């Protein structure tokens, strides 16, 4: 999978802004990991021209249709399942082969930080440490 | 807090490998965030020379005592609460969860606390993608 189409994430949380800015935050980590990410503005514009702005709609489109349009190897689907305040955010994701709809990868994360103090520095160190541990496990 | 002592993390999971190498993994992100930290090998050796190697013993020491030894402003305590894989027929799912708190080493006051629980399908493990997911989730927390 050289290239990834990231669709707007589904929001299954009570909070509107639960997904605000999230699609944008995926670009950098994915390029770092060696994937070509389809640029967001063009993707947004393509969906709009095709009469789709709603995330639920887009997540319902068959991956084969998406391939017809963009030529992406894969599609990244993200859903925020928790968002609210101690602030907690939880989300899950799957990477799907766009030609056959086969699942390529699946994962989820839930992260909490005491409302009393806010620091992505320390939060970043913690999640990084947890990901380091999984990378070294029996897989 | 500028200087941070990371003590050997507590393992509260059935898996003994649950914390292997974790102490080392905290150095880059902490320095990249601007804190000053000691190398894992240096910390481990100082505890050994002071008669301590067991993480539960260490997490029990009063922070003020730690400050007497290292001169650190704060102490970072990490606990792994889950580590393993649910072995199911069509796929196994690996889960790691940890919680942490940063405390002022002079008076024991808590300065920060957080936790993370991360899961991945075993059939198609991929640190890159798990990385981008946790990274996205932390970004959402940051902008709230």
Q: What residues contact A32, with CB distance under 8 A and at least 6 apart? A: B128
Listed resolution, Å: 1.9
Contacts of A28 in chain B (CB under 8 A): 135
Out of B26, B121, B134, the one facing A109 most closely (by C-beta) is B134
Q: Determine the longest span between alpha carbons in chain A, in angstroms.
A: 49
Q: Any idea which residue has 């601007």 for tokens? A: B34
Nearest one of B17, B18, B10 to B82, comparing CA atoms? B18
Nearest-CB residue to A134 (from B19, B76, B94): B94
Please give the residue of chain A at the shortest CA–CA distance from B115: A112
Chain A segment 2-41 residues within 8 A of B by beta carbon are 17-22, 25-26, 28-30, 32-35
Among A95, A125, A137, select the one facing B29 at the smallest CB separation: A125
| CATH number for A29 | 3.40.50.10610
Query: Which residues neighbour A45 within 8 Å (Cβ) at sequence distance 6 or greater?
Result: none
| Those residues with Cβ within 8 angstroms of residue B8's Cβ, 6 or more apart along the chain or in another chain | B19, B23, B43, B44, B47, B55, B58
Q: Choose the closest CB to B25 out of A109, A119, A129.
A: A129
Chain A nearest-CA residue for B112: A117
For A104, the closest chain B residue by CA position comes to: B124
Q: To which residue do tokens 């990410």 refer?
A: A37
Please give, rounded to a whole number of angstroms, the shortest distance from the CA of B43 to a CA of chain A.
18
Dihedral Cα A75, A76, A77, A78, nearest 10 deg: -170
Backbone angles phi and psi of A117, in degrees to 5 = -135, 145
Q: What would the two tokens of residue B91 be?
A: 């796929």
Q: Give the range of the structural domain holding residue A104, as residue numbers without chain letter.
A: 1-139
Distance between CA atoms of residues B48 and B41, nearest Å: 11
| Rounded distance between C-alpha atoms, residue A132 and residue B109, angstroms | 28
d(CA B34, CA A131): 21
Q: Write down how long chain A is.
A: 139
Residue of A nearest to B122 (CA): A139
Q: Please judge whether B120 and A104 are an interchain contact, meaning their C-beta atoms are less than 8 angstroms apart.
A: no
Contact predicate A7/A69, CB 8 Å:
no
Q: How far is CA A83 from the centre of its chain?
A: 15
Specify the number of domains making up chain B.
1
Method of structure determination = X-ray
Considering only CA atoms, which of A5, A10, A9, A23 is closest in space to residue A74?
Answer: A5
Q: Is A91 touching B (CB cutoff 8 A)?
A: yes
């Amino acid at each position: 999978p050289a290239s990834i189409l990231v669709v707007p994430p589904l929001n299954e949380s009570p909070d509107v802004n639960g997904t605000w800015g999230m699609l944008a935050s995926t670009a950098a980590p994915l390029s770092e990991a060696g994937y070509y990410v389809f640029p967001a503005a063009v993707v947004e514009e393509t969906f709009k021209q095709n009469g789709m702005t709603n995330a639920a709609d887009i997540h319902a489109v068959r991956p084969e249709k998406l391939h017809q349009i963009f030529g992406n190897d894969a599609v990244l689907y993200i859903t925020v399942t928790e968002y609210g305040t101690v602030t907690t955010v939880s989300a899950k994701a799957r990477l799907v082969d766009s030609r056959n709809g086969k699942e390529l990868w699946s994962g989820s994360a839930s992260i909490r930080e005491g409302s009393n103090n806010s620091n992505s520095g320390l939060l970043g160190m913690l999640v990084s440490a947890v990901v380091n541990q999984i990378a070294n496990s029996l897989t």
